[PDB]
Amino acid sequence: ENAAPAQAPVSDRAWALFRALDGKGLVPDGYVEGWKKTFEEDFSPRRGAELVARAWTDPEFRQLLLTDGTAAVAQYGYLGPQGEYIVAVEDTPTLKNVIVCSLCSCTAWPILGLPPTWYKSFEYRARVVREPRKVLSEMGTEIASDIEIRVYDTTAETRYMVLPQRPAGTEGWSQEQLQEIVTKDCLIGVAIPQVP
Amino acid sequence: MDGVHDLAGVQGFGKVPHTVNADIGPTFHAEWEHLPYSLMFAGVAELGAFSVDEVRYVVERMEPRHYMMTPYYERYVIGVATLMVEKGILTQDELESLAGGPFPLSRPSESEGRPAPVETTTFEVGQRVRVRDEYVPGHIRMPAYCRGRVGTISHRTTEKWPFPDAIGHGRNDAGEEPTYHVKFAAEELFGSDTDGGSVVVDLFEGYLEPA
Ligand SMILES: [Fe+3]
Ligand SMILES: [Mg+2]
Ligand SMILES: [Mg+2]
Ligand SMILES: [Mg+2]
Ligand SMILES: [Mg+2]
Ligand SMILES: [Mg+2]
């Protein structure tokens, strides 16, 4: 009762699916290898960090990013699969934004990178919509009492990034220096950028 | 579909397995893990055999206990394989032969889907809307926590997309609709039993009605 079905090892099943399709000529030469390279090397939170650092230092770009995220991201050439319609959401002294996909794992891949295991976890998918303050606290982020938490559930085609607040102690930093402190978790919204 | 995948608001789970900025390791933790997404795109972009919405739905169609004990990337291996069998591209026999053992698939669909609604309203930023109190057995991009609930429009998309409840079943009548960022107060969704402020859900026009 309630037992798992018998299954071949997952690696054997995954490669079986590949071999079945490839053996029928349905997978172009170098196709999955090309995607692997895109997923590993091109889709990266370093891109989102670059956008945040630009927005922090360029008021004009900040306005563009917050009004037409797609156009702003396109200027850098960072539109892509699972990142074709972008909305950036602005943290403020009274508002903290956090992103989830409660129904599966929807993530702005090209600018955040593929989602981490924890983001796809049942724990995150179930809990952050209902108790984001506790979830963030457990993860190491204390949200001050005078700050509204707003959770964006990625349920359609909009793909989100958080524009976090710029921390004190970074005045005059270069874009490269600022990029370094905007991590993947800052873009998802579970972390606040940290100054050494 | 009111399946176990509709996890938002479920109580009883423990801690999220992460502390902020902790090392998450490489993108892929095993040598097969890039295959589900790559082969999904082969199916969608190269073969034109199915939509991304159909991939979401086939994963929703995993037997519930099977879904709950299966790691993320493996669910997509199962889902893509299921679609290839359902579309007549592969057989389960050949998958199992190549795998060297059992390769159970998602369960067959119990709904033919539904068309894009004929009657909808164009909403504006600031307008109060209610999520239609409707029950859809096939694919739908409305998490149950917002069904019948009232919120305010914060964005109407400048692009339009096929209605998931149709294209998720491979139907010809998905049309195109914009979506709306609908902001709900936490208490509208979970009463006193929430520590949050607001939740914004990105909802197709066909899921909404004036408040
Ligand atoms: Fe998702
Ligand atoms: Mg497209
Ligand atoms: Mg300043
Ligand atoms: Mg300097
Ligand atoms: Mg439910
Ligand atoms: Mg297992």
Residues A132 and A143: their CA atoms lie apart, in Å, by: 10
Whether the CB-CB separation of B28 and A36 falls below 8 Å is answered with yes
Whether A20 contacts chain B with CB within 8 A: yes
Q: Which domain holds residue A67?
A: 1-196
Residues in A closer than 8 angstroms to B152, CB to CB, are: none
Q: With beta carbons less than 8 A apart as the criterion, state whether B177 and B65 touch.
A: no
| Ordered domains of chain B (ranges, CATH) | 1-110 (1.10.472.20), 111-211 (2.30.30.50)
Cα separation, A65 vs A67, in Å, equals 6
Sign of CA dihedral B83, B87, B91, B92: positive
Q: Would you give the DSSP letter of residue B42?
A: I
Nearest chain A residue to B198, by CA: A150
Beta strand A159-163 with A86-90 is parallel
Q: What three-state secondary structure class fits A70?
A: helix
- What distance in Å separates the CA atoms of residue B14 and residue A118, rounded to the nearest whole number? 12
Tokens 């539109």 belong to A79
> Could you tell me the resolution of this structure in angstroms?
1.4
Experimental technique used to determine this entry: X-ray
Closest CA to B163 of B112, B123, B114: B114
Contact criterion met (CB < 8 Å) for B10 and A32? no
Cα B60 to Cα B3, B69, B78, distances in angstroms: 7, 14, 11
Contact map slice: B 117-176 vs A, CB within 8 A: 141-143, 145, 155, 157, 159, 161, 164
Residue that has been written with the tokens 């936490």 in this structure: B186
Burial class of residue B115, CB neighbours in 10 A (0-12, 13-18, 19+): middle
Length of chain B: 211
Q: Looking at the complex, report in whole angstroms how far the Cα of residue B132 sits from the nearest Cα belonging to chain A.
A: 16
Return phi, psi of residue A71, to 5°: -65, -40
Q: Quote the tokens at residue A26.
A: 């349905």
Report how far residue A45's alpha carbon sits from residue B79's, in angstroms, rounded to the nearest whole number: 27
Count: domains in chain A: 1
At B201, which helix (H) or strand (E)?
Answer: strand B198-204
Q: CATH number for the domain including A114? A: 3.90.330.10
Integer angstrom CA distances of residue B148 from A77, B134, B143, B192: 40, 8, 11, 18
